[PDB]
Amino acid sequence: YRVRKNVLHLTDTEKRDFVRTVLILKEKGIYDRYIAWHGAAGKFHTPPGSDRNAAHMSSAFLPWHREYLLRFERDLQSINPEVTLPYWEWETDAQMQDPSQSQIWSADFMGGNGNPIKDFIVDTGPFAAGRWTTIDEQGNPSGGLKRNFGATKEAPTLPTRDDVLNALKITQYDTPPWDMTSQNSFRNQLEGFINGPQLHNRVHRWVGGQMGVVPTAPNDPVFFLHHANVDRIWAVWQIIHNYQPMKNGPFGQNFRDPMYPWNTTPEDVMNHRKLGYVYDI
């Protein structure tokens, strides 16, 4: 009953207010806590020495990011009670002739692509360099947001709608060993590791810049619009369908286990409505 809307459905004023609130969150110093939390989680392997981490490469990927967006949305709400987290339906923009033309990259929103002359720093939009500070891996100021639209040879295109529907056909949430090699797992599929980079991982690689990489991704506000759609994609599979592992998975990956760096568990966020929100569709 907080309603999360397609970025395409967002009145010119709804978009202005969303952007407005993100800058305030940034100015207050709240935005940085989110970049830091995501960076910390990515370095927290479960268990140590493994490839899995608290926020990725593990069953926790989906509930971790759901909790993350919920907390982010609550902070937006405390600034402006009329603002909720919109979602970027990339599945849809992939059909465009040229996706970089999508209304999501308008100057009055998340601006555009990076400038090749400025080493791919983005100057168009509310988060252009000079208007929005970024930080690096190390937590030090980095000098500006960057974006490389489909510049990689492994990710030249956004995930096609189809890629979404096939994933939704998967019957298991996840499967052991609960890692990147999991087969027939909705979680690993949606995350993008099956014939990587696909879906989730694919959007990250397609955007480029800080979004391209784990330790700095959140620096780009589009991170939240991306994840909103991923969360929505997960909520859809759930209309039909339960989570795995329940016990016996690495600590931090189990159904009822604290999700770093919080005490939140996957169980705690299994139903989005219990969380106070619902996707328009």
Angstrom CA distances, 274 to 45, 66, 219, stand at 29, 12, 29
Residues in the chain: 281
DSSP assignment letter at 158: P
State the number of binding residues for a copy of itself (CB under 8 A). 29
The tokens for 6 are 């397609």
Residue 130 interacting with a copy of itself (CB under 8 A) = no
Site string for Cu ion, 212-231 (x = CB under 5 A): --x-----------------
Site string for a copy of itself, 10-49 (x = CB under 8 A): ------------------xxx-xx--xx-xx--xxxxxxx
Specify burial of residue 280 (Cβ count, 10 A radius: 0-12, 13-18, 19+): exposed
> To the nearest whole angstrom, how small is the minimum distance from the Cβ of residue 102 to Cu ion?
19
> To the nearest whole angstrom, how small is the minimum distance from the Cβ of residue 42 to Zn ion?
8
Query: In terms of CB distance, is 120 or 234 closer to Zn ion?
Result: 234
42 CB-near residues (< 8 Å, 6+ apart): 53, 54, 55, 56, 214, 215
Q: Is 187 annotated as a binding residue?
A: no
> To the nearest whole angstrom, how small is the minimum distance from the Cβ of residue 135 to Zn ion?
9
> To the nearest whole angstrom, how small is the minimum distance from the Cβ of residue 153 to a copy of itself?
28
Residue 251 interacting with a copy of itself (CB under 8 A) = yes
Query: From the centroid of its chain, how far is CA 119?
Result: 24
Q: Can you tell me the distance from the alpha carbon of 179 to that of 194, in angstroms, rounded to the nearest whole number?
A: 11
Vertex 187: Cα angle to 185 and 190 (nearest 5): 105
Q: Is 67 annotated as a binding residue?
A: yes
Rg for the chain, CA atoms, rounded: 18
- Sites of contact with a copy of itself (CB under 8 A): 28-30, 32-33, 36-37, 39-40, 43-49, 53, 133, 135, 138-141, 250-252, 258, 260-261
- Sites of contact with Zn ion (CB under 5 A): 5-6, 9, 43, 91, 139, 161-162, 164, 235, 280
